[PDB]
Amino acid sequence: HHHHSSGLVPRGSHMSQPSILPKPVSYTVGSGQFVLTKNASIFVAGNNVGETDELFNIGQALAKKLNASTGYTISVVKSNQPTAGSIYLTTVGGNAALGNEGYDLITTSNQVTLTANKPEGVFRGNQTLLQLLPAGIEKNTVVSGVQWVIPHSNISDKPEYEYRGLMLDVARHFFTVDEVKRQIDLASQYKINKFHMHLSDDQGWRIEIKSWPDLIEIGSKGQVGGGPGGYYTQEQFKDIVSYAAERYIEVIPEIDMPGHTNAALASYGELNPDGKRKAMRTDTAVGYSTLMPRAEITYQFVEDVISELAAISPSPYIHLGGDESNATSAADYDYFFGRVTAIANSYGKKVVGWDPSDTSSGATSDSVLQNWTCSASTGTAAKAKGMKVIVSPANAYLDMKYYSDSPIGLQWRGFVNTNRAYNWDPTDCIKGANIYGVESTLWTETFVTQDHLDYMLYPKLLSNAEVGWTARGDRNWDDFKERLIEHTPRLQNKGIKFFADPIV
Numbered sequence: 303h304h305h306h307s308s309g310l311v312p313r314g315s316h317m318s319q320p321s322i323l324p325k326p327v328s329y330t331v332g333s334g335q336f337v338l339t340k341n342a343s344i345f346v347a348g349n350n351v352g353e354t355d356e357l358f359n360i361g362q363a364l365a366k367k368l369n370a371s372t373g374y375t376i377s378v379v380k381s382n383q384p385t386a387g388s389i390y391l392t393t394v395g396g397n398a399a400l401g402n403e404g405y406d407l408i409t410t411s412n413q414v415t416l417t418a419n420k421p422e423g424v425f426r427g428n429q430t431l432l433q434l435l436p437a438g439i440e441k442n443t444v445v446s447g448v449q450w451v452i453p454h455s456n457i458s459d460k461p462e463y464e465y466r467g468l469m470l471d472v473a474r475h476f477f478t479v480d481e482v483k484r485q486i487d488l489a490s491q492y493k494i495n496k497f498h499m500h501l502s503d504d505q506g507w508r509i510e511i512k513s514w515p516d517l518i519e520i521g522s523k524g525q526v527g528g529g530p531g532g533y534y535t536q537e538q539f540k541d542i543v544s545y546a547a548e549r550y551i552e553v554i555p556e557i558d559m560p561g562h563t564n565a566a567l568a569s570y571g572e573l574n575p576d577g578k579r580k581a582m583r584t585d586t587a588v589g590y591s592t593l594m595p596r597a598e599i600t601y602q603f604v605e606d607v608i609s610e611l612a613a614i615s616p617s618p619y620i621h622l623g624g625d626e627s628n629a630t631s632a633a634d635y636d637y638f639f640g641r642v643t644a645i646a647n648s649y650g651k652k653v654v655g656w657d658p659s660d661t662s663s664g665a666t667s668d669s670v671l672q673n674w675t676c677s678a679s680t681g682t683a684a685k686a687k688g689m690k691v692i693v694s695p696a697n698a699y700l701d702m703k704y705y706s707d708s709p710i711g712l713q714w715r716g717f718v719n720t721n722r723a724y725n726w727d728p729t730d731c732i733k734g735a736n737i738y739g740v741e742s743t744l745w746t747e748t749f750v751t752q753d754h755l756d757y758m759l760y761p762k763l764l765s766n767a768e769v770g771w772t773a774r775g776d777r778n779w780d781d782f783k784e785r786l787i788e789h790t791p792r793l794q795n796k797g798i799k800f801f802a803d804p805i806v
């Protein structure tokens with residue numbers, strides 16, 4: 303038999319017809335179609351009144367999306383007696399083998415029925431439902447001249463990995479609450495279920511800490527390149543968390559330590575050996591900054607930050623970073639990371655950290671390694687300690703240029719086009735580990751605007767999202783590529799300023 307790899311498309315990027323992404327476990331089409339009309343209602347039914355109430359909220363979210371493009375006013379009804387032309391969302395009799403995020407979605411001529419184990423699975427299934435309707439449905443304004451049909455069809459689905467995340471760096475360049483909400487919203491439509499906020503680094507500190515107010519008053523006032531910066535009040539952070547929660551997305555906040563700490567060091571002189579504030583940094587260098595590993599003030603500072611962040615962050619996880627501590631000795635890093643892990647645990651939080659943080663003698667089996675290096679020896683400690691691992695290889699470093707000539711992006715992990723972002727498996731990055739999942743990382747050294755974020759995340763994130771969701775045996779670039787071409791109008795309709803990748 304004959305095989306080949308994909309080259310660029312001759313003559314440029316290519317960028318009744320559903321466009322499901324990620325690919326679901328099964329999808330069959332039968333004869334006939336359901337028509338969504340102005341008289342349609344969404345019926346919801348759970349196993350008890352509490353669950354029905356949660357489903358009702360999910361139903362309202364769905365109705366909102368449908369109404370924006372159809373111009374209809376679909377409303378939601380708590381009833382297990384749906385009428386012809388209804389969408390029906392239920393958790394009664396879910397197939398347990400599909401787990402918390404799984405669902406069946408069956409469309410007949412008279413009814414769309416989504417059957418899940420949990421409200422969360424109804425939400426994920428609703429993302430598929432939106433992809434079964436014609437392109438145009440994802441418009442934010444009313445679309446005319448399109449019949450709102452769904453083919454008679456049967457889908458069963460569930461994720462391969464539990465953790466399927468996106469990280470946004472808001473330290474290097476700041477993005478507004480609206481901008482962040484939008485990225486969370488867009489990601490949610492592709493079954494991304496985790497959002498990691500990189501809230502602090504050398505060039506900026508982005509979260510209000512009431513006990514150390516100069517973190518904002520001084521530390522938030524810039525960013526890479528000398529723009530004005532910005533920050534989230536604790537109320538704004540809670541608002542982001544709440545917005546993500548409506549989409550069954552866990553928010554994991556990161557305060558990077560002991561390295562990548564210049565913004566803190568520029569805010570409080572007492573955090574430095576000479577007692578003087580550091581000058582703020584607006585360049586893109588890394589690895590030079592450190593907290594004082596052997597000063598108690600450092601641990602008081604960390605505790606105050608953790609105390610305030612834990613109070614406003616319901617995720618059982620806090621990310622404490624631990625990357626590129628090149629100004630911290632191995633011995634001091636081991637000690638520091640163990641101490642701050644003990645502090646986080648005292649505040650009821652489990653710690654996530656970049657490699658090599660798993661090597662700290664203070665880690666526990668509840669700690670999580672974010673494995674970015676993906677080398678033969680990375681996460682040896684994590685594996686021995688029974689720690690879950692989140693993988694972020696080059697293929698998930700979405701800040702990398704698509705190509706040599708990309709106008710934005712970095713290239714220290716090489717180039718990452720849409721094909722590279724697809725053609726990998728988590729088991730490639732680490733062997734013999736409990737792989738919790740995947741996280742796509744959008745660092746922002748070179749991204750200033752929302753358009754830059756869109757360009758780099760789309761279509762790259764779509765590839766990563768499928769790697770997290772779809773089983774490896776069902777993934778195939780030639781298949782995905784053609785599906786992505788089909789999906790293109792939907793990206794346009796959502797107002798996403800994606801890159802028309804010539805490999806698609």
Ligand SMILES: CC1=N[C@@H]2[C@@H](O)[C@@H](O)[C@@H](CO)O[C@@H]2S1
Nearest residue numbers: 588625626656674701712745
């Ligand atoms: C673990 C991370 N540490 C660094 C980040 O702060 C960014 O500079 C990123 C850019 O790709 O590079 C490395 S990867």
